[PDB]
Amino acid sequence: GHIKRPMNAFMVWSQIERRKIMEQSPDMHNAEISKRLGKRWKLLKDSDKIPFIQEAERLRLKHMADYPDYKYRPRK
DNA sequence: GTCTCTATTGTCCTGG
DNA sequence: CCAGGACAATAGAGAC
């Protein structure tokens, strides 16, 4: 089948925030949510971002362990 | 009912 | 070795 690629620090911080938006603005389109996420991301000071970089890190290590060999080969 | 596009950041792959 | 891309989450919008 098709194995997904790991979530980076931003994508991890994205899920959490997106929910808090999806629960507050249930009908706001996700494309616009992405726009606002990208902006809030630039607001969060660098220091605050560490926890997610570490979080995202283990996410990748586990990824290899679970999927011994998967080449990220996307193409058009 | 079924796909494809919409958008963000970060990260890996390819062509030149 | 750099630019340009695909793609991870997410559901709706639009074509068909």
Curated annotation (Swiss-Prot):
It comes from the Eukaryota. Coiled coil: none annotated. The modification N6-acetyllysine is found at K39. Expressed in both gamma-delta T-cells and Cd4+ Cd8+ double-positive (DP) alpha-beta T-cells. Expressed in the ovaries and the thymus. It is found in: Nucleus. Residues 3-71 bind DNA. Transcriptional activator that binds with high affinity to the T-cell enhancer motif 5'-AACAAAG-3' motif. Required for IL17A-producing Vgamma2-positive gamma-delta T-cell maturation and development, via binding to regulator loci of RORC to modulate expression. Involved in skeletal myoblast differentiation by promoting gene expression of CALD1. Interacts with UBE2I. Interacts with HDAC1; interaction inhibits the transcriptional activator activity. May be involved in the T-cell immune response in the psoriasis-like disease which is induced in mice by the application of the TLR7 ligand Imiquimod to skin. This is Transcription factor SOX-4. It comes from Mus musculus (Mouse). The lineage of its organism: Eukaryota, Metazoa, Chordata, Craniata, Vertebrata. The chain holds residues 57 to 132 of 440 of the full protein.
